[model samples]
Target: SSEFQINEQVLASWSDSRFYPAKVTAVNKDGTYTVKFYDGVVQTVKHIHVKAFSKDQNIVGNARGSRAHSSHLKSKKG
Candidate 1:
């Protein structure tokens, strides 16, 4: 369900405002990714935080990776 595939190069936007150079190490079952940044910092994030690495390219929806299922907060009304 994500535009990103395994071993794909991408620009992942994280804590800071700038996106970093990274590679998709693993595609999680929940549509997230284990990204290995050039800084050697590996982070597992959702598709919402991952995007194409190549410049002037298309992108995907980016946001907070909150996936906690709880009572009265498990479903979407939309």
Candidate 2:
């Protein structure tokens, strides 16, 4: 049960662009935090938000793919 409860109510933040590497940041309720697959840039901090934990993984996977995944990003390979 505890495993499924992970990331609940957490903030899932990320940035995806060939200009920069894909990054994932998670902020916990206790003020602790973590950033995965990042470059430690200042702009990364500014893009943070109160993300739905349930949406965390989905956002990460969506951000990774260039096309056939997210309709928002411009397609790179047809």
Candidate 3:
């Protein structure tokens, strides 16, 4: 399997069993990637947990609708 490179954007399957967007910062010797999430937290994840973010793939549905839904609710109440 190809190793994930530093500075590459990827989607990491978090320990909570949900996927989150992250950026690879380092490649560990044990086939793990060190990633930094948008929230600025860093974590070492195994190869199986990291996946390349590709433009050809649609990943919008995987995102949380927290902000969007909150805005929609505000508008409804306004």
Candidate 4:
């Protein structure tokens, strides 16, 4: 089954059929994923509501993980 992984980028579609780019922040125990949208809003969504996002340039795993952590920290700081 396709699913969102932590720190993975995705496009999440809402009930109104609008889609937004986001990053998977956490996987909840209830089978939902917590994502941080590009607009800086966080939302919890199901697997069916999201699709993986591909970047124009690939980033290294460590670098990507570090960036994810850094972003997480910044969000908390604000």
Candidate 5:
């Protein structure tokens, strides 16, 4: 009850063989969603086309975990 369609999760919707981000206004039991795209184009799609958009910030992890990691020298082959 706290996870499905809280109206904040980004939707990686399918379109033209591509997954584009959409803002879902409502979630139905039919597995379909009422959503719109970046250009404010409101439309509808099937469940097969809906995917919760998951964007990972690799930059944050790399910066914090690397800690200025600069060990990219040649191997001790010569």
Candidate 6:
């Protein structure tokens, strides 16, 4: 666990209003994480900059799994 607190600036990426307000699961150097919502249950979601969360927000950081690989392809494809 990282030293994260409420109202701290975190990076809540890959999430939206469709299912929001996830619980803080773990804290990282850049952000505070919220549990990823899966089937209405808490899953694995992390928010590095909590203060900058928004549905239309796009972050210049990691996006886990295939998204990560795809991002690389986009760079190469272009």
TM-score of each: 0.53, 0.21, 0.55, 0.49, 0.51, 0.26
Q: Between which residue pairs do clashes occur in model 5? A: none
CA-only RMSD, every prediction: 14.0, 10.0, 11.1, 9.8, 15.1, 12.8
What are the per-residue Cα lDDT tens digits for candidate 5 across 14-48?
45565565567766675566776656566676665
Residue 48, model 4, lDDT: 54
For every model shown, the clashing-pair count is 0, 0, 0, 0, 0, 13
Span of ten consecutive residues with least summed lDDT in model 2: 64-73
Question: Which stretches in model 4 have alpha-carbon errors above 4 Å?
Answer: 1-4, 14-16, 54-78
Extract clashing residue pairs from model 1: none
- For 6-45, candidate 4 gives per-residue lDDT tens digits of 7866556644465556677876555466778655678787
Scored by lDDT, model 4 comes in at 0.51
After aligning candidate 1 to the native by TM-score, how far in Å is the CA of 32 from where it should be? 0.6
**Candidates' lDDT values, in order?**
0.56, 0.31, 0.54, 0.51, 0.46, 0.34
Candidate 6 at 17: error in angstroms?
6.9
Order candidates by lDDT, high to low.
1, 3, 4, 5, 6, 2
The all-Cα superposition gives candidate 3 an RMSD in Å to the true structure of 11.1
lDDT of candidate 6? 0.34
lDDT of prediction 5:
0.46
Q: Model 1 TM-score?
A: 0.53
lDDT of model 2 at residue 60?
35
- Badly placed stretches (over 4 Å) of model 3 are 1-4, 55-78
- For residues 1-78, write the lDDT of model 2, one tens digit per residue: 211122322233435532222233453444333443333432223223322234333233233212121123223322
User: Candidate 2: global Cα-lDDT?
Assistant: 0.31
Q: Candidate 3 local accuracy as lDDT?
A: 0.54
lDDT of 3 at 42: 91
Candidate 2: which stretches are off by over 4 Å? 1-11, 16-32, 38-53, 56-78
Evaluate model 6: give its TM-score.
0.26
